[PDB]
Ligand binder design. Structure first.
Ligand SMILES: Nc1ccc2c(Cl)cccc2n1
Lengths: 39, 156
């Protein structure tokens, strides 16, 4: 039996750690909801 | 139990110790997570029970106590914050500019940030702190790194 515990408010935090790139990707989505790289 | 808005951890005791299987958002008395986290199972909050109300394996989305409430969208321009909630670790904002999933049915925002699968369900925010979707369903790229969709539901 799974259960939930609160972990924080939902807020924009000015001067948070700014990382990660912005890739453009060709993908397909199956009936099962799993994504896949179309190449 | 606790109905306060904000982000929650999703835990099981069915394995060794207490294990965090994913994350979710309480808003307007509705709890929003990803389907692969709960598998449409009921949840506990204090002595309270949360029963599934809506879900779709293909969207990989599921709401508890009411219909999906989160109707904010990436503008396709501005940066966003992943309010990440990792297992064992404190909530932490990570700011990024999303890439794109190109599909036959349309283009979807994507966030390239790599975190344990237990982080599935963590929300993604616009500059006004509105939830524009959920992290935890996407794809592994050439490098072996993970890239997640910005997964958003439809409100009524
Ligand atoms: N390497 C991986 C594999 C699966 C993942 C899921 Cl399901 C969610 C978030 C990150 C992930 N990273």
């Amino acid at each position: 039996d799974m259960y939930i515990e609160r972990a924080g408010d939902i807020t924009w935090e000015k001067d948070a750690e700014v990382t990660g790139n912005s890739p453009r990707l060709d993908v397909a989505l199956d009936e099962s909801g799993d994504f896949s790289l179309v190449e | 139990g606790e109905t306060t808005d904000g982000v929650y951890r999703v835990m099981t005791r069915r394995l060794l110790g207490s294990t965090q299987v994913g994350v979710g958002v309480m808003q307007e008395g509705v709890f929003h997570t990803m389907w692969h986290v709960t598998k449409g199972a009921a949840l506990r909050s204090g002595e309270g029970r949360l029963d599934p109300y809506w879900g779709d394996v293909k969207q990989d989305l599921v709401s508890y106590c009411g219909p999906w409430k989160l109707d904010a969208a990436w503008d396709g321009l501005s940066e966003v914050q992943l309010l990440a909630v990792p297992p064992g670790e404190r909530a932490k904002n990570i700011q990024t500019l999303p890439g794109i999933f190109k599909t036959k049915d349309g283009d979807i925002g994507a966030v390239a940030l790599d975190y344990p699968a237990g982080t599935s369900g963590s929300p993604i925010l616009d500059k006004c702190g509105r939830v524009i979707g959920l992290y935890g369903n996407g794809v592994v790229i050439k490098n072996g790194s993970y890239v997640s969709a910005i997964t958003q539901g439809k409100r009524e």
